[PDB]
Amino acid sequence: QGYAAEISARRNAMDNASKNAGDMINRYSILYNRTRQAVITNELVDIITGASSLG
């Protein structure tokens, strides 16, 4: 009985873990997209600024 109770609460805990991991993936994907866009933009700024101070 405690064996089945353990596997029940274990299955519950792994379900909660999958749910929390999905939520945290949903946050860090948005963080990833903002980071990627900011990196490309910020290096393009330096590309332009070098092309800005030409003769």
Place this chain on the structure above:
Amino acid sequence: KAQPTEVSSILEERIGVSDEANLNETGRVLAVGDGIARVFGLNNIQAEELVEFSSGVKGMALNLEPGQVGIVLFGSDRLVKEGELVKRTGNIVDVPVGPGLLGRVVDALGNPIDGKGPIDAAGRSRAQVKAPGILPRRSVHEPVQTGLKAVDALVPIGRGQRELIIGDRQTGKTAVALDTILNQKRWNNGSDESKKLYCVYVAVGQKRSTVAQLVQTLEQHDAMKYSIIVAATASEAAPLQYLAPFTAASIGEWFRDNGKHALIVYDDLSKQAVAYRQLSLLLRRPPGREAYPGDVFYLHSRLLERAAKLSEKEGSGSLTALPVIETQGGDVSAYIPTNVISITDGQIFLEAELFYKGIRPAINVGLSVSRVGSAAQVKALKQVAGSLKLFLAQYREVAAFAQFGSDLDASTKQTLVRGERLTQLLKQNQYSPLATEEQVPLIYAGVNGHLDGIELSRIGEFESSFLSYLKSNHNELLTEIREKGELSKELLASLKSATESFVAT
């Protein structure tokens, strides 16, 4: 008929101006590419002066140089050709102001696009007017009854309180200020001007079909007799979209300086920032964070600072502002909104998931707040909603706590049930504003746990049922809430009896 030819021929008589047409301005256009134009001459031009090109397109001379002047266009460059003749108006950029602007739909320059003839303007006013100093102000003390449930419950708005509506795409943002304008029909049908409140909606960079349907809808509910629409749609030039909210702000200042009370709604400042960085990059000016020029904070700053409550020395005018910011995926850490948050007097966050759950309005209470709204809340609502935000934050605490399926005590399960009832309570359909006398008893029922025995699905019919119940029967109490805006103990107990009566069903 021929009366349009009569009016146009009187305008042909004005076309008298040719007898005194010695313009001290005309100069050749050096170059004109990428939404800009360098013009030689104009040696008595003023800074930020309106000029007009030979192809009819006007422009603002923005930067002055020894040798030339760089003038931005107010349209497509397809009309402006090199080497032409550039007459100056003689004026810093001004727009028509006056009462006849009500009902009309204009461009960024007050030129009407409704096709309803000319504009009865009471004057012309500059665009970049100084915001009033700290002395001709007053702290807000008068409510702005938006008609929405959770808005008027949790985030009250003072006359002149600069409150941000922030959200995401297709998240019910526009409908909020729309239904606020529709609530203002109550007093705009009335007679006291200090009770009246005039509405200016500023649609920039949007679809002409969308603006047409909005104007159509405002004519259906007959908000048009107090409405002013400023259209700066996406087909039009970026400087027009840059310029139009300043013009509507001048209109709001015209109403405010007449002692009257007025509401302006910006929708959206996000595209205005896009147009402004489009300008600045075509000005070859260096960008900063997220490719914006660093003055874009100063831009929306100097826009929104021209909206406050005048003191009695100025005639107690007010001008309340509703900016709209479309963010990207619920982000509140992009460079543009964090600037606006540092300007406005509070936030109305719309969570995408709540509207994805169909909860309309999709108000995240935990993010949305006003700073000085409590000083100008309706006094009855201030009486009856003191525990309300506390109880909703309390229910929010046990909201994420109850997802684990664990059973709880009667206290937290009680807060769970009552907060579910309050959550399903505050939904509200579009074009359905609620008066304060209507909003009071729903709050009084929601506080005192009467909704707990009612089914969670039954709440929506229960609302209208109990409202029609009171309007049928306790109409005297509705008039008491209307007249006082404040519940006495006798009104409190009579309200209690009138609730618990229909709570028995």
Place this chain on the structure above:
Amino acid sequence: GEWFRDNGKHALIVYDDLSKQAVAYRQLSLLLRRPPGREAYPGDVFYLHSRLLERAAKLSEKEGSGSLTALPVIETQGGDVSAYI
């Protein structure tokens, strides 16, 4: 390859790679003071490869049904497809 293709024949070409070729064209355009774009690339670099790869085709029986087939090679960096080239 188009010589074989217009002989009613069958030609496979393998470009290996195109990433170095894009770097070379980037260098040529940057030293020619053309205005750079994303990751300092020129604007027409897409116009480069689109003008390249469309030269491989499968011809008509009216033409003689020649066939040029292209196998280009893209060296990615860190297993990324979001990079511009």
Place this chain on the structure above:
Amino acid sequence: STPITGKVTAVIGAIVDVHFEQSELPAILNALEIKTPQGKLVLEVAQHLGENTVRTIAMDGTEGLVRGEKVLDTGGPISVPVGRETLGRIINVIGEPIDERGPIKSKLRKPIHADPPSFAEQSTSAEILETGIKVVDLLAPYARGGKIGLFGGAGVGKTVFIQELINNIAKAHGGFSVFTGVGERTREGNDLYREMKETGVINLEGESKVALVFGQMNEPPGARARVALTGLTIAEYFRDEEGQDVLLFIDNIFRFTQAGSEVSALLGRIPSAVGYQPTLATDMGLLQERITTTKKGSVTSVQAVYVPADDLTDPAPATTFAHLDATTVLSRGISELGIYPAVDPLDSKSRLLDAAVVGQEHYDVASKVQETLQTYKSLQDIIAILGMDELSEQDKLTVERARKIQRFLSQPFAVAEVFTGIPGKLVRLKDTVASFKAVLEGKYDNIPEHAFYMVGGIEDVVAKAEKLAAEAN
């Protein structure tokens, strides 16, 4: 009469500079011709640099050019031929027929940079464009003169879907179709044209019901940032001359955005965010607001959207989503179940899915359908795990209902008649509402699930039920 002869002074890739003689300068956005040995080369005045000298961008390859050659000005913008002659012709961005069926003997030619219709000319209430397809007319209804974001990669019958749309508009409303491949793969454009001949929407001798414009990939960005405006002007003619509802099909809007960004890059403008052009909102709004519903008629535009590297905060889909009134998603999983079309029911959403738009009944029907399929999709885990044992009579009813709808969403195609043999059905709106409503009430729960796969309507429900009952007997 007056040849405005210009001289080439600078050729930089696709950028051409022309010095003119005095007081002869054309305005911005005008076609300029150069008689090459290989044809004509077209230029487009975009920047008056002063000194009687302007800057244009190319419309084809700029090889072998000598600076100082005679430049012929057309005065106006790019004239493109319009009219009944244009149906079933393959047209470049220039306006020339490239199907090698001879010249297009159109009567009128129109400039491509026309203005959008005024605010007064906007039809102040978007009705529903009745397409003919059950799922589209049910779940994500299209505005008559609206914007439609089609998602999904190739291989899902997306071309089959859009040809079925062409035939359903041709039968239903009689308006025509204008397809526009901006940056289209030339091999795939050929396969598309060959199929459209074979499926009959192009009749080489009779009435082709569609006009094609293919800006191929090998064309400079000056072409590909104008192919969309060419197809736009062609559709605007059939709206504003014939008073119809004309459907503009655009692939790809994202390649068009790339073209506009590359054009702004080659003009030496400072790039904005993401590497896109700084004129991105304006370059979009010049395309969108010329697509609307007049009082003469409407142009309804369906356009594919590639999501770039699977990001929605990317400003090009974030700009496109500020115009799309309705979305349509061709998932693989729906085509995986052998369902034609491959429409995901859950994702394809409209801003006109509203009771004050489609009426209260259509709204409530679509509401119950979305709720039923949402509950079904939520149950799909324990359906495979535990089975129908955990379903109550509340539940297994709704599970069966959603299976019946999921088969019933499938529609025979008038274009998949050489493919499947089953003729398609122009399924009307009012039949579709009542059909899904009678399924939502449960009046055909006795009918098996198999009697719903690839059917027209509720009359075809009853007919296939009786036929499968007779074949089982």
Place this chain on the structure above:
Amino acid sequence: AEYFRDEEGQDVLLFIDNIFRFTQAGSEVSALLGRIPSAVGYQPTLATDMGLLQERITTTKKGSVTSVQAVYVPADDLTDPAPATTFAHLDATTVLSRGISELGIYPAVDPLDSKSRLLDAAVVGQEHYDVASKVQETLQTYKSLQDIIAILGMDELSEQDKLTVERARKIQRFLSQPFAVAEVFTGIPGKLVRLKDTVASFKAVLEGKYDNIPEHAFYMVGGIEDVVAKAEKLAAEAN
């Protein structure tokens, strides 16, 4: 301010809001002043103008200037050059996180990242230093365990770690303090809590004398006696 510091020789409270707006004003004109744009979008003369501003804000032998300056952070990026430059000029940092405010913790001071040139055991007293040391250790332990709490929760902890997380989360709610200024946001009277009582309060919390008291009774409270009072109210009301 420096006039009264020099002419009068008094104690000058200089409140500045917002010092970031100054550097931003230095940024907006610099592109028009012909300068090449520097880092991010700011001006090249950032640290120099910041220095000439800050070095006049000082305490001489003549007078005493106690200055408090708000610092706006652009989009919560502390790696922005303007606040990072500003850190070099300050004696006592105090950092407000939005995420701490999202837990309703007012004020939303980060307990870790605040620093001082003060807080030495031979300055604040040894016991004060020790208590603050143990508080920072406890909260650092909690912030380290935060990710495992996010994935697994408090159940997959060791019991010493679980007790530490419990005590730290009690401490976090105990940090919040009712303001007389923000009374219109709370309806709660402000709490001017003395120093030594605060030290003994955190002492007894680190000693765990109130681990029996639930976490919510620590929230938005004055001294530890007020935690006792609020726990009494929760015991009498929640029952």
Place this chain on the structure above:
Amino acid sequence: AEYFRDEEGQDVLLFIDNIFRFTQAGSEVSALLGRIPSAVGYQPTLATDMGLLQERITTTKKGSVTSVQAVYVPADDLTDPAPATTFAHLDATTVLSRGISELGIYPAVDPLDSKSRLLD
């Protein structure tokens, strides 16, 4: 090295470090040569200068050059092009890794990415 290969006819070992300082110093001046700054902060003339330096390092039929080049990787980024170009010039790539050094094990070689052309 070229002298002791070709003018000598003899096996030559070659030990170059740092090859990254070459491209680095080219980038350090190419901005002040009036070149438009390319990608990552490097010069536009990266692959050409790297090629002309590497292709003069070879084993001819006249003599053998064995090249050992220690290459700097800025902040352990292999997708940095100035390390990433160098992979095209090398037969025996041998990769160190800081995370392996965090185990304290020496030599902290990645057993995976250190490939060979001689691994037949």
